[PDB]
């Protein structure tokens with residue numbers, strides 16, 4: 219059994235293993251860091267099955283849950299939020315914060331998302347490129363999703379800049395285990411004081427909604443409000459940052475695609491759909507443990523055995539997406555949906571928000587900076603380490 223996670227074939231490419239497994243052994247065993255053996259499913263068909271089956275569990279306390287790292291094994295001991303719950307506890311807690319993320323709620327947030335993007339672009343323009351390109355990640359990719367989520371949670375405007383750097387420190391590569399931990403409790407501590415304020419003086423934000431609708435009536439404890447809020451902050455922020463930078467690099471890599479977008483910003487949604495398919499920036503989140511014997515393909519996964527469903531592999535499934543390894547915003551989509559945001563009940567709560575932010579960024583960026591270009595040779599782009607999810611650390615640009 220090969221050790222998993224697999225290493226990306228290269229900077230922007232998924233692991234070379236998926237393609238061969240998909241063709242020769244769709245459902246197979248891999249070995250985790252601690253010697254454990256888990257099942258790895260690679261076909262779109264099987265990934266959807268794993269993501270919806272009632273015979274599979276997301277509870278991390280269950281022996282056999284596929285933890286990918288030592289640190290991950292230690293994080294499993296904390297009190298769970300809906301992300302690690304099975305029905306009916308899952309939807310019961312998830313429905314408490316879901317209203318802000320529905321398609322219509324997100325449609326009403328468009329004017330705000332647009333202004334945030336416009337303001338950040340202007341700030342970046344107000345420092346030019348005086349014999350010095352700017353890092354698109356620090357100046358734009360990072361602030362955009364951070365300010366938005368922080369603002370929705372309830373953080374006052376003047377605190378956004380500092381809190382944005384703190385959250386970034388948690389997931390930063392050059393961060394010690396000490397500074398990452400200090401950043402965590404810093405964010406948690408701030409969220410606690412915020413919940414106290416919103417209990418006294420509630421307002422229009424996710425925390426006030428929790429306090430007024432769930433905390434006060436005794437539905438959940440204050441610590442729970444802190445947990446869910448913290449979950450909403452850390453769950454997909456690092457991912458959004460990478461998706462934005464990955465989108466810019468991809469347009470740099472296919473000038474023909476960029477030309478079409480510049481000529482018609484209306485193509486943004488299609489570009490985003492292909493981007494979330496082609497670059498599956500969150501590839502290790504669909505994991506389960508079998509509650510009972512279940513047959514997947516020709517294999518039979520026994521009770522208490524772990525399963526990892528690769529949505530990244532599923533998104534390159536030749537059986538579903540014709541010419542999967544080709545990035546094409548003009549591609550004709552099949553009836554089966556891409557799995558960039560997961561599938562089933564645990565499908566990303568912020569999928570519509572994530573897409574709205576990306577569409578806003580990509581329908582505005584090149585209208586503001588028509589001549590925007592990566593300042594370093596494409597082969598020199600600083601991608602995240604090959605054994606981690608796909609992303610970009612920094613991205614030098616001139617405009």
Ligand code: HEM
Pocket residue numbers: 269300301302312367449450451453454455457458461499500501503504529557558559560561562563564565566567568569571572
């Ligand atoms: C483009 C960026 C994003 C990508 C590609 C992404 C991807 C995913 C994926 C693959 C899952 C796993 C779902 C499953 O188990 O099937 C997920 C879950 C989740 N995401 Fe995102 N996500 C993104 C942004 C966000 C943002 C911005 C937030 C926060 C507002 C967020 C919050 C969550 C939460 C809380 C869950 C767990 C939902 C549940 O278990 O019911 N995600 N996301």
